[PDB]
């Protein structure tokens, strides 16, 4: 299994600021098959980023993902108040899909 380790577990920041979230894989993620999801309380996950750096339709430019091999990062250049949620990373690059533990952004 490809273990996805996310840090920090929790971050507290102010509106306007930059959130930098890490997702480290225990092994190279083939084809950059790595996605990010936003999840607000009571709601279903929402795709933000796939293929490491591809922004999903309707996702604001302030969200951008990057990285390759084992080190990935989601950057929210300037936080809006609605941006506060849990963020999961996800590798679809083998036959046992796995997720990170999530990062809560306050």
């Amino acid at each position: 299994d490809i273990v996805l380790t996310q840090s920090p577990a929790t971050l507290s920041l102010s509106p306007g600021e930059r959130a930098t979230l890490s997702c480290r894989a225990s092994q190279s993620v083939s084809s950059n098959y790595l996605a990010w999801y936003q999840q607000k309380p009571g709601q279903a996950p929402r795709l933000l980023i796939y293929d490491s750096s591809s922004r999903a339709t309707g996702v604001p430019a302030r969200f951008s993902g990057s990285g390759s091999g084992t080190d990935f990062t989601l950057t929210i250049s300037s936080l809006e108040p609605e941006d506060f949620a849990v963020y999961y990373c996800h590798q679809y690059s083998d036959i046992s899909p796995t997720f990170g533990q999530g990062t809560k952004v306050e």
Partner: protein, 123 residues
């Protein structure tokens, strides 16, 4: 484009449930479909995958031999047959369209809650 789960509810350990996911707004038969669950207050955990028919299927180690995924393309419907439920299975179950290189899990249903509980006694 939309998925709608159903079939969740409260059951006691050892019981069984069959969940349903009704797809619309896309060519169902050409999508791989997955179930992903979330225990209350916990992270996302992938449960099961099916291909176009395929019939190739894949299961997380925790549900192997108890759960069975299937699809009926003529009904635009994905299914999860949950046998031998245990407390640890308690979670919201989401169905998702897996678009791979074309979007990962780009479409999610609203989820359906499965609670497996004897009610606290008999521990």
């Amino acid at each position: 484009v939309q998925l709608v789960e159903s079939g969740g509810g409260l059951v006691q350990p050892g019981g069984s449930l069959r969940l349903s996911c009704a797809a619309s707004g896309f060519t169902f038969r050409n999508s791989a479909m997955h179930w992903v669950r979330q225990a209350p207050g916990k992270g996302l955990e992938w449960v099961s995958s099916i291909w176009y028919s395929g019939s190739n299927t894949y299961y997380a180690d925790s549900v192997k031999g108890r759960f069975t995924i299937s699809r009926d393309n003529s009904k635009n419907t994905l299914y999860l047959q949950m046998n031998s439920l245990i407390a640890e299975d308690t979670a919201v179950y989401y169905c998702a369209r897996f678009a791979g290189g074309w979007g990962a899990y780009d479409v999610w249903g609203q989820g359906t809650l499965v609670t497996v509980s004897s009610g606290g006694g008999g521990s």
